[PDB]
Amino acid sequence: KSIRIQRGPGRAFVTIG
């Protein structure tokens, strides 16, 4: 389980695993 979520203007969310 390894997620990749970013926050802030022009930021997208991602998830891996």
Side-chain angles (χ1 to χ4, degrees), residues 4-15:
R4 187 60 60 170
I5 32 178
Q6 224 168 219
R7 34 71 48 79
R11 300 261 218 284
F13 292 127
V14 189
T15 77

Side-chain angles (χ1 to χ4, degrees), residues 1-4 14-17:
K1 293 285 181 204
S2 268
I3 326 303
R4 187 60 60 170
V14 189
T15 77
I16 312 98

